[PDB]
Amino acid sequence: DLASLAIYSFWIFLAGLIYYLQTENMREGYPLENEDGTPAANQGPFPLPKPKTFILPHGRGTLTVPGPESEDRPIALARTAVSEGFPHAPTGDPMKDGVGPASWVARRDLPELDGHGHNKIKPMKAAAGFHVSAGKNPIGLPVRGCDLEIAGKVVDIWVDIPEQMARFLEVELKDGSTRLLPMQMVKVQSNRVHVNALSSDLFAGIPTIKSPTEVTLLEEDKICGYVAGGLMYAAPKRKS
Amino acid sequence: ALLSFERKYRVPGGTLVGGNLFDFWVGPFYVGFFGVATFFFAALGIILIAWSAVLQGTWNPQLISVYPPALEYGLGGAPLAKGGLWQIITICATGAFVSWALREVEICRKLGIGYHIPFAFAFAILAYLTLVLFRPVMMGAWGYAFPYGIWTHLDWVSNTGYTYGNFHYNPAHMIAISFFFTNALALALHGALVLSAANPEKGKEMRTPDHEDTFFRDLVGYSIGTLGIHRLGLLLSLSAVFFSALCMIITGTIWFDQWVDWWQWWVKLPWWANIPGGING
Amino acid sequence: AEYQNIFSQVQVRGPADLGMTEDVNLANRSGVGPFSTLLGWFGNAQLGPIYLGSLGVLSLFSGLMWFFTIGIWFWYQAGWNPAVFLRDLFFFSLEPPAPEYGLSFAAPLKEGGLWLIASFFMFVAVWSWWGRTYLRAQALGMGKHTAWAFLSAIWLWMVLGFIRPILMGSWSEAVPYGIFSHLDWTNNFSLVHGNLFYNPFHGLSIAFLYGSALLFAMHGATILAVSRFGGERELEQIADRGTAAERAALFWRWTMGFNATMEGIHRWAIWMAVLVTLTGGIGILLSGTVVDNWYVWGQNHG
Ligand code: BCL
Ligand code: BCL
Ligand code: BCL
Ligand SMILES: CC[C@H]1c2cc3[nH]c4c(c3C)C(=O)[C@H](C(=O)OC)c4c3nc(cc4[nH]c(cc(n2)[C@@H]1C)c(C(C)=O)c4C)[C@@H](C)[C@@H]3CCC(=O)OC/C=C(\C)CCC[C@H](C)CCC[C@H](C)CCCC(C)C
Ligand SMILES: CC[C@H]1c2cc3[nH]c4c(c3C)C(=O)[C@H](C(=O)OC)c4c3nc(cc4[nH]c(cc(n2)[C@@H]1C)c(C(C)=O)c4C)[C@@H](C)[C@@H]3CCC(=O)OC/C=C(\C)CCC[C@H](C)CCC[C@H](C)CCCC(C)C
Ligand SMILES: COC(C)(C)C/C=C/C(C)=C/C=C/C(C)=C/C=C/C(C)=C/C=C\C=C(C)\C=C\C=C(/C)CC/C=C(\C)CCC=C(C)C
Ligand SMILES: COC1=C(OC)C(=O)C(C/C=C(/C)CCC=C(C)C)=C(C)C1=O
Ligand SMILES: CCCCCCCCCCCC[N+](C)(C)[O-]
Ligand SMILES: CCCCCCCCCCCC[N+](C)(C)[O-]
Ligand SMILES: CCCCCCCCCCCC[N+](C)(C)[O-]
Ligand SMILES: CCCCCCCCCCCC[N+](C)(C)[O-]
Ligand SMILES: CCCCCCCCCCCC[N+](C)(C)[O-]
Ligand SMILES: [Fe+3]
DSSP: OHHHHHHHHHHHHHHHHHHHHHHHTTSSSOSOBOTTSSBOSOOOSOOOOOOEEEEETTTTEEEEESOOOOOOSOOOEEESSSSTTSOEEESSOHHHHTOGGGOOOOOOSSOOBOTTSSBSEEEGGGSTTOEEEESOOOTTOEEEETTSOEEEEEEEEEEETTTTEEEEEEEEETTSOEEEEEGGGOEEOSSOEEESSOOGGGSTTSOOOSSTTOOOHHHHHHHHHHHHHHHHHTGGGOOO | OBOTTOGGGOOSOOOSSSTTTTOOEETTEEOHHHHHHHHHHHHHHHHHHHHHHHHHTOOOTTTOEEOOOOGGGTTSOOOGGGTHHHHHHHHHHHHHHHHHHHHHHHHHHHHTOOSHHHHHHHHHHHHHHIIIIIHHHHHTOGGGSOOEETTHHHHHHHHHHHBTBSGGGOHHHHHHHHHHHHHHHHHHHHHHHHHHHHSOSTTOOOOOHHHHHHHHHHHHSOOOHHHHHHHHHHHHHHHHHHHHHHHHHTBTTTBOSOGGGGGHHHHTOTTTTTOOSSSOO | OOOOSSSOSOEEEOSOOOOOOTTOOGGGBOOOOOBOTTGGGTSOOBOOOOBOHHHHHHHHHHHHHHHHHHHHHHHHHTTTOHHHHHHTTTTOOBOOOOGGGTTOSOSOGGGTHHHHHHHHHHHHHHHHHHHHHHHHHHTTTOOSHHHHHHHHHHHHHHIIIIIHHHHHTOGGGSOOBOHHHHHHHHHHHHHHTTOGGGOHHHHHHHHHHHHHHHHHHHHHHHHHHTGGGTTTOHHHHHHSOOHHHHHHHHHHHHHHSOOOOTTHHHHHHHHHHHHHHHHHHHHHHHBTTTBSOHHHHHHSOO
């Protein structure tokens, strides 16, 4: 009857929907590759969807996906086995080389912009008149690493202007230069800011930004990847 | 076999047990010690279900059902064909689920990401355990647990609920439901909002999160923001399950009468219990 | 113990954000409301502005009139006694006309007339609110995904209070306005239709409801887990994939053998959610119009 027709139709619809959804979700990262970067023989049963194009605001261009995929950066890893499916060992210092959990993506070397075309993220000192509105103000506190040594001191908060949120702490090092630390990777305490991801000796290695009052998407990725990578790679210098 | 961007993340390390022994992939799947454990537990579980099927004398997926020991067995063991298989399958399930969570932890550690996902999953596991382990233990028999069958588990839900009248009257169940409904509402809105920004009117530039905040302030006078919405979805879905587990752990233990009668405590308050008129006077 | 980004450690505030202009009639925006530091631990601290406009006024007025029509009936049932009002709050109920009145608007006020009036106000409130989800997206140049999603919820609501009663031939089939009574209505509906557990559209609606919680737990946890790489900035991750979007995808590829993108997760999201009420409204609409007894139907499969 009509209910039988409804249910049968629904299942046909649902198969169609899942096919649509899976192929939509193949707009990045496909075709699949062998470990050497060449196209894999087996691409699975879903084909790539027809490309769509996103128009980016503020003259930044467009993005068309699916599109030719490439890392656009060297990857300092090598095989540890003679067959597919094993780990790839860092050929150098994985924190410096940006691989494993220290990885970064070659994102656009421009700052993310707000809806008005201004830099989305700014040091609070340059953001009129943004200020700490609740919680312990981290500015001025010593910054301790997982080796329990002081690596520097907080000199500003970098804030997301349209979303009114703390995004980074700016930390000045012993040599007077600064680095950005992701807000998600620090613990603000009463007398210090604690960073479990990095021992104090790794702070100098945090990727620097090219201009002192802005940060590009590329620079954010290198900074965040490097800091997260310390969880695995500074484990020898941590320490309860 | 690899996403185009995948290789740089496939480094050694992050394992919880076994060092490098199981540090590898099979096609897309990470293995790890807990991948091996999941396979063992799942495989044994599935084999035992197929054996339970033989003893039941059916292979139909809509008919296969693995029932726990009858109430007379209390919390003891039972013959395999009479509840023992359920008991072993349940240990297998638990082993598989917990192994799955711990394998998710190894994957987090290799990827340098937060542990939020397996943390969240552990809520679902705790709800499963409330029904098959915690509640039956507190009530004193395995037989109060649900059977493993597609339709029989629904018989269990209906029979269990109607034991206490209309189960709608469980107040923890009311809260659980509210979180379920609110979660689906927020899921719809989040999905829609992001897509409406990423896919604007024809020919227009992608909108920004400023536009997402704007749309929602225009609409209801508030926007939780892009961080807040993901905090929210996580909170609503975990709260729904927390209150689901709560609503069942208190049923047949601290409250075992008709749930509708629980509400009399409010009606019977001295100040108004005896004023005429209304529904209850 | 690491920081988990469930609550913020430090809040910042700057000038009140008045929002994007695009094509919005700015004459119709309120001023900004207060700032709530409480809210700001978890979400945005800012309240307002809100957009008013005449459609806005209509929905609000209508919605209030719906609420007040029910509330006046409740006071009446309480015999105008505040103590009895609060005591019996969850027990009062504004009920639809008796079956005998069919679909006519000729029932007495105290016996269904008032239910129809409240229902009328609800109808205009919801539909004018739907218009508003479309128009606020339009004025901003945005897609219409919100109004499309809202329409799926509206579908179940329309099925329950309007389409199913019309097709059954009487307002008596609709849902009463009351806390306990709507629950009794729900239980009764299932009992009277041979147990909704046998309605495949009810089982589907459940799979999607549970699936919504599974999916929001998955997505919310994933985004928080990659917030240390800016993962919640999803629009710019769509435009320019970062290590947040890659680590998220790979968590899932390594776990379950497949994954999403930053854009496409939002499509699994919207559909998982809207299919709750889409399949639901279908299951209810068929109940009593085409199928009297789901258990019986299920025995014939058809
Ligand atoms: C007639 C029946 C009664 C009823 C009696 C009951 C009873 C009895 C129960 C509920 C429970 C639920 N009811 Mg009730 N309730 C009814 C009316 C309703 C109505 C309604 C609109 O009328 C609603 C919305 C709800 C909703 C609720 C939810 C709060 C809750 C179910 C979700 C849950 O526990 O998730 C928690 C999620 C899980 C348990 C899933 C865990 C799974 C994980 C760990 C692993 C599985 C994966 C594995 C097998 C993989 C497969 C292989 C492949 C990999 C895929 N009920 C009526 C009145 N209700 C249940 C509850 O709260 O349980 C705690 C419960 O026991
Ligand atoms: C949660 C509270 C109640 C309960 C209430 C109900 C009610 C009421 C209904 C279901 C329904 C479902 N339940 Mg149940 N169910 C319970 C506990 C479970 C458990 C468990 C704890 O292990 C499992 C695996 C299931 C699984 C099932 C599915 C057969 C079906 C769709 C669920 C879904 O899409 O979820 C969301 C999750 C996803 C979308 C992910 C996909 C996972 C599913 C599809 C996996 C199926 C597993 C199944 C075939 C078991 C095989 C295991 C193998 C041996 C490995 N339920 C407890 C007892 N469940 C519906 C149904 O139609 O049943 C006939 C239904 O109406
Ligand atoms: C004894 C009870 C029966 C039963 C009888 C019913 C009945 C009857 C129905 C359901 C329905 C549902 N049941 Mg059932 N249900 C049973 C047992 C279960 C169990 C379980 C046992 O674990 C579960 C999990 C569920 C789960 C579900 C859901 C999947 C589904 C509702 C989806 C929804 O989002 O609605 C919530 C969403 C809405 C109602 C949409 C809201 C619409 C908008 C327009 C809101 C406007 C509001 C505004 C004007 C007011 C604003 C106020 C604010 C302050 C601003 N049922 C048992 C067998 N179930 C529904 C369904 O679809 O079934 C097929 C339904 O009609
Ligand atoms: C807590 C919020 C919600 C939630 C969260 C959640 N679920 C999760 C996770 C999270 C964050 C994932 O990380 C994990 C996942 O990998 O998802 C894709 C998962 C997951 N949730 C899943 C299912 C699921 N979650 C559910 C519910 C929920 N999950 C909550 C609503 C339900 C419901 C509502 O019924 C189901 C069916 C899986 C898709 C996945 C976990 C997969 C897994 O543990 O794999 C290892 C085990 C096997 C491969 C099979 C084991 C076989 C057994 C040994 C035998 C079978 C016994 C079983 C008890 C019989 C049941 C018969 C039924 C008919 C009753
Ligand atoms: C896809 C399925 C899920 C879903 C989707 C969904 N719901 C939605 C949306 C979508 C995508 C909309 O965009 C729309 C929305 O605007 O959300 C914010 C909405 C919405 N879903 C709502 C509720 C709701 N949705 C339901 C759930 C669900 N919605 C499903 C689970 C439920 C359940 C589970 O029963 C409820 C109760 C509303 C919050 C909103 C629709 C708002 C509306 O139609 O308003 C009409 C009435 C009024 C304008 C006001 C009524 C008056 C109040 C009773 C009084 C108190 C408040 C008052 C406004 C204060 C003002 C006083 C001033 C004068 C000071
Ligand atoms: C303290 O006193 C004050 C002044 C504050 C007042 C207090 C107010 C109170 C206590 C209000 C209480 C309200 C309650 C308890 C509301 C509960 C409502 C519930 C639970 C509703 C649930 C189901 C609702 C549904 C499904 C209704 C759907 C209705 C429609 C689809 C509308 C259909 C339109 C019809 C039939 C009208 C036909 C007219 C035309 C021509 C369109
Ligand atoms: C599309 O994403 C969403 C937001 O929009 C950016 C929200 O804002 C909210 C609403 C959040 C809350 C806390 C409601 C209560 C409001 C106050 C004033 C306390 C929801 C559900 C949502 O889904
Ligand atoms: C909940 C719907 C069911 C989801 C499972 C279907 C999607 C699996 C797609 C796997 C394909 C992955 N692949 C080969 C394209 O890389
Ligand atoms: C939009 C956030 C509001 C959540 C609404 C969900 C309804 C649940 C009822 C709230 C009671 C929960 N609690 C823990 C405060 O008791
Ligand atoms: C569903 C979420 C409800 C959000 C609550 C609405 C807050 C409105 C604040 C607008 C303030 C307007 N004001 C006071 C400046 O006139
Ligand atoms: C966005 C779509 C995700 C696909 C998830 C589909 C889950 C289907 C579960 C099968 C339930 C079938 N049944 C018995 C309820 O009719
Ligand atoms: C509804 C549950 C069905 C289980 C299948 C889930 C989809 C997983 C597909 C991933 C397999 C990818 N592959 C082919 C490379 O192995
Ligand atoms: Fe998101």
